[PDB]
PDB file of all heavy atoms in Angstrom:
ATOM      1  N   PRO A 290       9.231  44.024  19.720  1.00  0.00           N
ATOM      2  CA  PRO A 290       9.375  42.567  19.610  1.00  0.00           C
ATOM      3  C   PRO A 290       8.922  41.837  20.854  1.00  0.00           C
ATOM      4  O   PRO A 290       8.421  40.712  20.755  1.00  0.00           O
ATOM      5  CB  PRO A 290      10.876  42.377  19.359  1.00  0.00           C
ATOM      6  CG  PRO A 290      11.326  43.654  18.793  1.00  0.00           C
ATOM      7  CD  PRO A 290      10.518  44.699  19.491  1.00  0.00           C
ATOM      8  N   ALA A 291       9.086  42.439  22.032  1.00  0.00           N
ATOM      9  CA  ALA A 291       8.587  41.813  23.249  1.00  0.00           C
ATOM     10  C   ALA A 291       7.071  41.713  23.228  1.00  0.00           C
ATOM     11  O   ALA A 291       6.507  40.695  23.635  1.00  0.00           O
ATOM     12  CB  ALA A 291       9.053  42.593  24.470  1.00  0.00           C
ATOM     13  N   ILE A 292       6.393  42.758  22.752  1.00  0.00           N
ATOM     14  CA  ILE A 292       4.939  42.705  22.621  1.00  0.00           C
ATOM     15  C   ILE A 292       4.535  41.619  21.634  1.00  0.00           C
ATOM     16  O   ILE A 292       3.586  40.862  21.872  1.00  0.00           O
ATOM     17  CB  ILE A 292       4.389  44.078  22.197  1.00  0.00           C
ATOM     18  CG1 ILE A 292       4.598  45.106  23.305  1.00  0.00           C
ATOM     19  CG2 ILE A 292       2.922  43.976  21.846  1.00  0.00           C
ATOM     20  CD1 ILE A 292       4.175  46.501  22.922  1.00  0.00           C
ATOM     21  N   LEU A 293       5.252  41.521  20.514  1.00  0.00           N
ATOM     22  CA  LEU A 293       4.897  40.537  19.498  1.00  0.00           C
ATOM     23  C   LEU A 293       5.133  39.110  19.989  1.00  0.00           C
ATOM     24  O   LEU A 293       4.358  38.206  19.667  1.00  0.00           O
ATOM     25  CB  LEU A 293       5.680  40.815  18.219  1.00  0.00           C
ATOM     26  CG  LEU A 293       5.488  42.225  17.657  1.00  0.00           C
ATOM     27  CD1 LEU A 293       6.641  42.620  16.761  1.00  0.00           C
ATOM     28  CD2 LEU A 293       4.181  42.329  16.909  1.00  0.00           C
ATOM     29  N   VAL A 294       6.199  38.886  20.757  1.00  0.00           N
ATOM     30  CA  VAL A 294       6.430  37.566  21.336  1.00  0.00           C
ATOM     31  C   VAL A 294       5.388  37.264  22.402  1.00  0.00           C
ATOM     32  O   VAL A 294       4.885  36.138  22.498  1.00  0.00           O
ATOM     33  CB  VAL A 294       7.852  37.464  21.915  1.00  0.00           C
ATOM     34  CG1 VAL A 294       8.017  36.159  22.654  1.00  0.00           C
ATOM     35  CG2 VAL A 294       8.875  37.556  20.827  1.00  0.00           C
ATOM     36  N   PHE A 295       5.075  38.255  23.238  1.00  0.00           N
ATOM     37  CA  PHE A 295       4.102  38.057  24.300  1.00  0.00           C
ATOM     38  C   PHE A 295       2.733  37.746  23.726  1.00  0.00           C
ATOM     39  O   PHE A 295       1.956  37.014  24.335  1.00  0.00           O
ATOM     40  CB  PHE A 295       4.043  39.298  25.188  1.00  0.00           C
ATOM     41  CG  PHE A 295       3.172  39.139  26.395  1.00  0.00           C
ATOM     42  CD1 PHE A 295       3.685  38.622  27.567  1.00  0.00           C
ATOM     43  CD2 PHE A 295       1.843  39.508  26.360  1.00  0.00           C
ATOM     44  CE1 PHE A 295       2.889  38.475  28.681  1.00  0.00           C
ATOM     45  CE2 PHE A 295       1.044  39.360  27.468  1.00  0.00           C
ATOM     46  CZ  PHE A 295       1.569  38.843  28.630  1.00  0.00           C
ATOM     47  N   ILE A 296       2.423  38.284  22.547  1.00  0.00           N
ATOM     48  CA  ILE A 296       1.152  37.963  21.905  1.00  0.00           C
ATOM     49  C   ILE A 296       1.078  36.475  21.591  1.00  0.00           C
ATOM     50  O   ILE A 296       0.089  35.807  21.911  1.00  0.00           O
ATOM     51  CB  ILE A 296       0.959  38.819  20.642  1.00  0.00           C
ATOM     52  CG1 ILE A 296       0.511  40.227  21.024  1.00  0.00           C
ATOM     53  CG2 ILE A 296      -0.029  38.160  19.708  1.00  0.00           C
ATOM     54  CD1 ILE A 296       0.486  41.190  19.871  1.00  0.00           C
ATOM     55  N   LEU A 297       2.127  35.928  20.975  1.00  0.00           N
ATOM     56  CA  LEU A 297       2.136  34.504  20.652  1.00  0.00           C
ATOM     57  C   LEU A 297       2.095  33.650  21.910  1.00  0.00           C
ATOM     58  O   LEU A 297       1.325  32.685  21.991  1.00  0.00           O
ATOM     59  CB  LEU A 297       3.373  34.162  19.824  1.00  0.00           C
ATOM     60  CG  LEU A 297       3.500  34.818  18.455  1.00  0.00           C
ATOM     61  CD1 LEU A 297       4.873  34.557  17.886  1.00  0.00           C
ATOM     62  CD2 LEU A 297       2.430  34.287  17.530  1.00  0.00           C
ATOM     63  N   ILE A 298       2.913  33.997  22.906  1.00  0.00           N
ATOM     64  CA  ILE A 298       2.967  33.208  24.133  1.00  0.00           C
ATOM     65  C   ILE A 298       1.630  33.255  24.858  1.00  0.00           C
ATOM     66  O   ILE A 298       1.108  32.221  25.289  1.00  0.00           O
ATOM     67  CB  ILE A 298       4.112  33.698  25.038  1.00  0.00           C
ATOM     68  CG1 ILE A 298       5.463  33.530  24.349  1.00  0.00           C
ATOM     69  CG2 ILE A 298       4.106  32.939  26.344  1.00  0.00           C
ATOM     70  CD1 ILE A 298       6.628  33.938  25.215  1.00  0.00           C
ATOM     71  N   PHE A 299       1.054  34.449  24.998  1.00  0.00           N
ATOM     72  CA  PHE A 299      -0.233  34.608  25.657  1.00  0.00           C
ATOM     73  C   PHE A 299      -1.321  33.845  24.922  1.00  0.00           C
ATOM     74  O   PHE A 299      -2.069  33.076  25.530  1.00  0.00           O
ATOM     75  CB  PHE A 299      -0.576  36.097  25.747  1.00  0.00           C
ATOM     76  CG  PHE A 299      -1.948  36.382  26.284  1.00  0.00           C
ATOM     77  CD1 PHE A 299      -2.157  36.516  27.639  1.00  0.00           C
ATOM     78  CD2 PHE A 299      -3.020  36.545  25.429  1.00  0.00           C
ATOM     79  CE1 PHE A 299      -3.413  36.788  28.132  1.00  0.00           C
ATOM     80  CE2 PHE A 299      -4.274  36.813  25.919  1.00  0.00           C
ATOM     81  CZ  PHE A 299      -4.470  36.936  27.271  1.00  0.00           C
TER      82      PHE A 299
END
Side-chain angles (χ1 to χ4, degrees):
Chain A
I292 293 176
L293 304 158
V294 173
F295 186 88
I296 282 172
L297 297 170
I298 298 183
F299 174 88

